[PDB]
Each structure stands twice: as C-alpha cells, then as structure tokens.
Design an enzyme around this catalytic site. Structure first.
Site, PDB file in Angstrom:
ATOM      1  N   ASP A   1      45.647  41.824  35.087  1.00 53.06           N
ATOM      2  CA  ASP A   1      44.690  42.177  33.925  1.00 53.06           C
ATOM      3  C   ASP A   1      43.656  41.262  33.682  1.00 53.06           C
ATOM      4  O   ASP A   1      43.614  40.078  33.825  1.00 53.06           O
ATOM      5  CB  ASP A   1      45.721  41.661  32.680  1.00 53.06           C
ATOM      6  CG  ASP A   1      44.960  42.117  31.256  1.00 53.06           C
ATOM      7  OD1 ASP A   1      45.127  43.322  30.793  1.00 53.06           O
ATOM      8  OD2 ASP A   1      44.444  41.158  30.531  1.00 53.06           O
TER       9      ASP A   1
ATOM     10  N   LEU B   1      55.293  44.020  35.287  1.00 54.15           N
ATOM     11  CA  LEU B   1      54.536  42.633  35.388  1.00 54.15           C
ATOM     12  C   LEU B   1      53.271  42.611  36.033  1.00 54.15           C
ATOM     13  O   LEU B   1      53.031  43.064  37.157  1.00 54.15           O
ATOM     14  CB  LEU B   1      55.623  41.806  36.233  1.00 54.15           C
ATOM     15  CG  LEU B   1      55.526  40.194  36.296  1.00 54.15           C
ATOM     16  CD1 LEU B   1      55.275  39.580  34.943  1.00 54.15           C
ATOM     17  CD2 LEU B   1      56.572  39.668  36.962  1.00 54.15           C
ATOM     18  N   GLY B   2      52.397  41.974  35.230  1.00 60.72           N
ATOM     19  CA  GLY B   2      50.998  41.685  35.853  1.00 60.72           C
ATOM     20  C   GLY B   2      50.718  40.370  35.635  1.00 60.72           C
ATOM     21  O   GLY B   2      51.437  39.424  34.940  1.00 60.72           O
ATOM     22  N   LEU B   3      49.303  40.090  36.365  1.00 63.53           N
ATOM     23  CA  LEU B   3      48.920  38.649  36.142  1.00 63.53           C
ATOM     24  C   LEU B   3      47.789  38.730  35.227  1.00 63.53           C
ATOM     25  O   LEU B   3      46.781  39.438  35.378  1.00 63.53           O
ATOM     26  CB  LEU B   3      48.257  38.158  37.588  1.00 63.53           C
ATOM     27  CG  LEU B   3      47.729  36.664  37.429  1.00 63.53           C
ATOM     28  CD1 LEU B   3      48.717  35.761  37.506  1.00 63.53           C
ATOM     29  CD2 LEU B   3      46.895  36.399  39.136  1.00 63.53           C
TER      30      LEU B   3
ATOM     31  N   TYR C   1      35.970  37.724  30.075  1.00 62.32           N
ATOM     32  CA  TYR C   1      36.594  36.501  30.629  1.00 62.32           C
ATOM     33  C   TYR C   1      35.556  35.794  31.505  1.00 62.32           C
ATOM     34  O   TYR C   1      35.925  34.566  31.985  1.00 62.32           O
ATOM     35  CB  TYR C   1      37.893  36.959  31.214  1.00 62.32           C
ATOM     36  CG  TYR C   1      38.956  37.491  30.588  1.00 62.32           C
ATOM     37  CD1 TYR C   1      38.890  37.358  28.908  1.00 62.32           C
ATOM     38  CD2 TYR C   1      40.214  38.082  30.849  1.00 62.32           C
ATOM     39  CE1 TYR C   1      39.885  37.902  28.296  1.00 62.32           C
ATOM     40  CE2 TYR C   1      41.030  38.695  30.149  1.00 62.32           C
ATOM     41  CZ  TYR C   1      40.936  38.497  28.846  1.00 62.32           C
ATOM     42  OH  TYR C   1      41.760  39.130  28.098  1.00 62.32           O
TER      43      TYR C   1
ATOM     44  N   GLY D   1      50.751  60.272  33.343  1.00 62.34           N
ATOM     45  CA  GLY D   1      51.372  60.664  34.440  1.00 62.34           C
ATOM     46  C   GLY D   1      51.420  59.671  35.611  1.00 62.34           C
ATOM     47  O   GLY D   1      52.051  60.136  36.642  1.00 62.34           O
TER      48      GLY D   1
ATOM     49  N   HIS E   1      38.720  46.564  23.968  1.00 62.75           N
ATOM     50  CA  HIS E   1      39.432  45.184  23.930  1.00 62.75           C
ATOM     51  C   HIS E   1      39.783  45.012  22.510  1.00 62.75           C
ATOM     52  O   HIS E   1      40.901  44.415  22.399  1.00 62.75           O
ATOM     53  CB  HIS E   1      38.272  44.267  24.570  1.00 62.75           C
ATOM     54  CG  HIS E   1      38.876  42.988  24.991  1.00 62.75           C
ATOM     55  ND1 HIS E   1      38.066  42.427  26.127  1.00 62.75           N
ATOM     56  CD2 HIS E   1      40.012  42.122  24.667  1.00 62.75           C
ATOM     57  CE1 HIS E   1      39.077  41.057  26.119  1.00 62.75           C
ATOM     58  NE2 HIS E   1      40.114  41.008  25.348  1.00 62.75           N
TER      59      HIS E   1
ATOM     60  N   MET F   1      52.828  52.428  36.052  1.00 60.54           N
ATOM     61  CA  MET F   1      52.387  51.020  35.581  1.00 60.54           C
ATOM     62  C   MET F   1      53.224  49.830  35.985  1.00 60.54           C
ATOM     63  O   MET F   1      54.299  49.959  35.402  1.00 60.54           O
ATOM     64  CB  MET F   1      51.828  50.764  34.102  1.00 60.54           C
ATOM     65  CG  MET F   1      51.131  49.754  33.698  1.00 60.54           C
ATOM     66  SD  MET F   1      50.308  49.745  32.372  1.00 60.54           S
ATOM     67  CE  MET F   1      49.363  48.271  32.099  1.00 60.54           C
TER      68      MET F   1
ATOM     69  N   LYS G   1      38.713  45.868  30.441  1.00 63.28           N
ATOM     70  CA  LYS G   1      38.697  46.083  28.919  1.00 63.28           C
ATOM     71  C   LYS G   1      36.924  46.055  28.612  1.00 63.28           C
ATOM     72  O   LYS G   1      36.434  45.252  29.000  1.00 63.28           O
ATOM     73  CB  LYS G   1      39.362  45.129  28.072  1.00 63.28           C
ATOM     74  CG  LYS G   1      40.588  44.550  28.779  1.00 63.28           C
ATOM     75  CD  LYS G   1      41.476  43.807  27.661  1.00 63.28           C
ATOM     76  CE  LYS G   1      42.695  42.976  28.309  1.00 63.28           C
ATOM     77  NZ  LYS G   1      42.410  41.899  29.229  1.00 63.28           N
TER      78      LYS G   1
END
Ligand SMILES: NC(=O)c1ccc[n+]([C@@H]2O[C@H](COP(=O)([O-])OP(=O)(O)OC[C@H]3O[C@@H](n4cnc5c(N)ncnc54)[C@H](OP(=O)(O)O)[C@@H]3O)[C@@H](O)[C@H]2O)c1
Ligand SMILES: O=C(O)COc1cc(Cl)ccc1C(=O)NCc1ccc(Br)cc1F
Ligand SMILES: [Br-]
Length: 313
Positions: free
Chosen positions: A44, A16-18, A49, A10, A111, A13, A78
C-alpha cells in the site's frame, strides 16, 4: 480464510499487505524487499507519502531478481487531494507509476473525498489555517478514475475515507461505469466501523483496514492517547493463542473479511506480521475485540474539517 479476496472487477487481492506511510526513504527499500522475500504480495502506497520512488526500487529489484512475477504482486496507490481536477488525474497516476517503476497499478484510490487547490503544497492553507478547497466534486473525480481503467493505467479503482453517504453518492452516480472495488478506512478495536463495513460489504465493495495497530508512530500522537498494542485485554487474547498482540490485531480484520495493511520498517516485525495464517480467533474473541470500540480515530485533521466533503463528525 483464503489469502486473496475476489474484487468486483474480477481480480483477486491479497488480504495482507505492507503499509508504507512514515516508512523512511532510507529504510523502505529494504522493508519492501524483506516483505516480498517473506511472502507479502500487496504493498500500500501513496504519492503523498513521499517515498514511492524508494518503494519502487524494491519492487523492481524483486521483479528483476525473479523472486516474484508482476502478475503475482498487488500494488496500490492513491490520488492526492491536490489532483482532483480532470486535467490533473492522469498525470498524477502516471507520476506514481513512474516512481513505482510500474506500467499499471492493481488498485488506485481516491485518497480522501476532498479536493484541494492544485499546486506544490499538499495542504494549501489560507492565512487562517483552513485548507483551500477545490470546487471539483467526488462524482467528477470518479469519472476521471474510470478513465484510468479505460486507458490501461490501473486494473481497479476505489475510494478511501469515504463515509456512508459518500459511498452511496458514488454508487448512485448517473452513468456510473465502474463501481468502486475497495473503500480503505481506518479500522481497529477502538474504531470498529460496524456500520460502514456492513454497508460497503452489502454492496460488494471490499473494505481495507488501515492503521490496524493504532498507528503508534503517527506524528500527532499524544502521550495520553489509548494504545492498542499495550492494551492488557488484547495482550491476554494474544497470550491465550501464543501470538503477539500485533498478530491478533492483524488477524482480527482478516476474520471480518477485510484486507489489512500493517506498516513496519523493522525486518523482524515485517516477518512477525505475516505469520497470521496459522491460527484462528474464536467468535467470542472477535466479539470481545469488537466490544473495545470507542470511536477513537487516528486519522483526522482539524485544518480540513470545514471542507464541504470532510468525511467525519
Ligand atoms: N488511506 C488512508 O488515508 C491511510 C491512512 C493511514 C494509513 N494508511 C495506510 O495504512 C498503513 C498502516 O497504518 P499506519 O502506518 O497508520 O499504522 P499501523 O500499521 O497501525 O502501525 C504502524 C506502527 O506500528 C509499529 N509496528 C508494526 N508492527 C509491529 C509489531 N509487530 N509490533 C510492534 N509494533 C509494530 C511500526 O513500527 P516500525 O515501523 O518501527 O516497526 C509503526 O510504528 C499505512 O502505512 C498506510 O499504508 C492509509
Ligand atoms: O492520509 C493518510 O494516508 C495518512 O495521513 C497523512 C499522511 C501524510 Cl503523508 C500527510 C498527512 C496525513 C494526514 O494528516 N491525514 C489526515 C487527513 C488528510 C486529509 C483529509 Br481531507 C482529512 C484527514 F484527516
Ligand atoms: Br477529506
């Protein structure tokens, strides 16, 4: 297309993301600040990372500055493979929340389908270089993800790098409480993913395309590998539209109803990559880009190929 896609929880999103994998910790704070200033509303992230604290500094500063409201951001992280245990999932999520300076995530993903032995090492190996598995399966890990929704830590849950059979396993889980909202997979003109995308979309799962530029900075790149950004056929499509090759590579997944998460730490490229809402690729362009598929994967890893749940062949 609209700038946001409706998920099966619901919520909406941003398409486009970085991306933030490989963004150096001394550069990523500024990258995220610039991204938010120029319009990005989706970041993201991942614990593996190693830069979530620095991402979080940027998010928090922009919230403090009132550049954006929390409700207008869509922050994704993730669960790493060494935290696929019942008793480790909540703490893993909480460490990410603490680092990112958040009280919830918009989306939290498994992930990779594979669980590894818990411990300090992200890739625990045996003395012959094989990853050391966890016996915990994807269904029990999914139940743990569902608990995070029910505790208010995350608004949506999903999966990443799950193959067709693995997505089906989740959908067929006895007692399934929440469907995955997203499957985040590698996707670009050299790995077009028609089969898996159609399956996921038919089930109402939104697909996010990672490595849309072919991850030229992946640490295992070899000089002879194909190069999307340098492909003269893609350059020609870009020139026709008076856009950059990267802009074509970003618009391509958007027109397939995918979310896309190009990574950059270069301010000018961060801005370039966002300028993808004022042009359209034709159907012929789309089919032409699809024709470049060669089943070429950026993300694969030999050390993990015997894990029982390794997703690729
Ligand atoms: N779920 C998973 O397993 C998974 C796996 C891989 C990736 N991801 C996510 O997806 C994101 C994107 O994938 P990726 O990082 O592998 O690679 P990518 O986004 O395909 O490519 C990033 C590379 O392209 C360069 N670049 C960016 N914009 C450019 C432009 N306009 N012109 C020329 N070069 C440009 C960047 O350079 P500079 O940064 O130097 O500008 C960097 O070297 C990741 O960062 C991560 O967030 C997830
Ligand atoms: O996995 C990602 O998001 C991007 O790739 C990596 C990022 C970091 Cl920080 C470290 C290593 C990788 C990396 O090696 N990812 C590939 C990978 C990993 C796990 C499994 Br089960 C399969 C597989 F192909
Ligand atoms: Br895996």
């Amino acid at each position: 297309m609209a700038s946001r896609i409706l998920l099966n929880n619901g919520a909406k999103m941003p398409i486009l993301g970085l991306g933030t994998w490989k963004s150096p910790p001394g550069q990523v704070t500024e990258a995220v600040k610039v991204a938010i200033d120029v319009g990005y509303r989706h970041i993201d992230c991942a614990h593996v990372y190693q830069n979530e604290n620095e991402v979080g500094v940027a998010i928090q500063e922009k919230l403090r500055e009132q550049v954006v409201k929390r409700e207008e951001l869509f922050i994704v992280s993730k669960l790493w493979c060494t935290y696929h245990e019942k008793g480790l999932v909540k703490g893993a999520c909480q460490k990410t929340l603490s680092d990112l300076k958040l009280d919830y995530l918009d989306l939290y993903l498994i992930h990779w389908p594979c669980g590894f032995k818990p411990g300090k090492e992200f890739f625990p190996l045996d003395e012959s270089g094989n990853v050391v598995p966890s016996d915990t399966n994807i269904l029990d890990t999914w139940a743990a993800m569902e608990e995070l929704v029910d505790e208010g830590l995350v608004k949506a849950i999903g999966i990443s790098n799950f193959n067709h059979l693995q997505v089906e396993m989740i959908l067929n889980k006895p007692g399934l409480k929440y469907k995955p909202a997203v499957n985040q997979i590698e996707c670009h003109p050299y790995l077009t993913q028609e089969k898996l995308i159609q399956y996921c979309q038919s089930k109402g799962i939104v697909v996010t395309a990672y490595s849309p530029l072919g991850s030229p900075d992946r640490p295992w790149a070899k000089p002879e590998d194909p190069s999307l950004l340098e492909d003269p056929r893609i350059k020609a499509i870009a020139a026709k539209h008076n856009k950059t090759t990267a802009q074509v590579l970003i618009r391509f997944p958007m027109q397939r109803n995918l979310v896309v998460i190009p990574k950059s730490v270069t301010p000018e490229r961060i801005a370039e990559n966002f300028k993808v809402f004022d042009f359209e690729l034709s159907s012929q362009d789309m089919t032409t880009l699809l024709s470049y598929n060669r089943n070429w994967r950026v993300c694969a890893l030999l050390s993990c190929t015997s894990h029982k749940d390794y997703p690729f062949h």
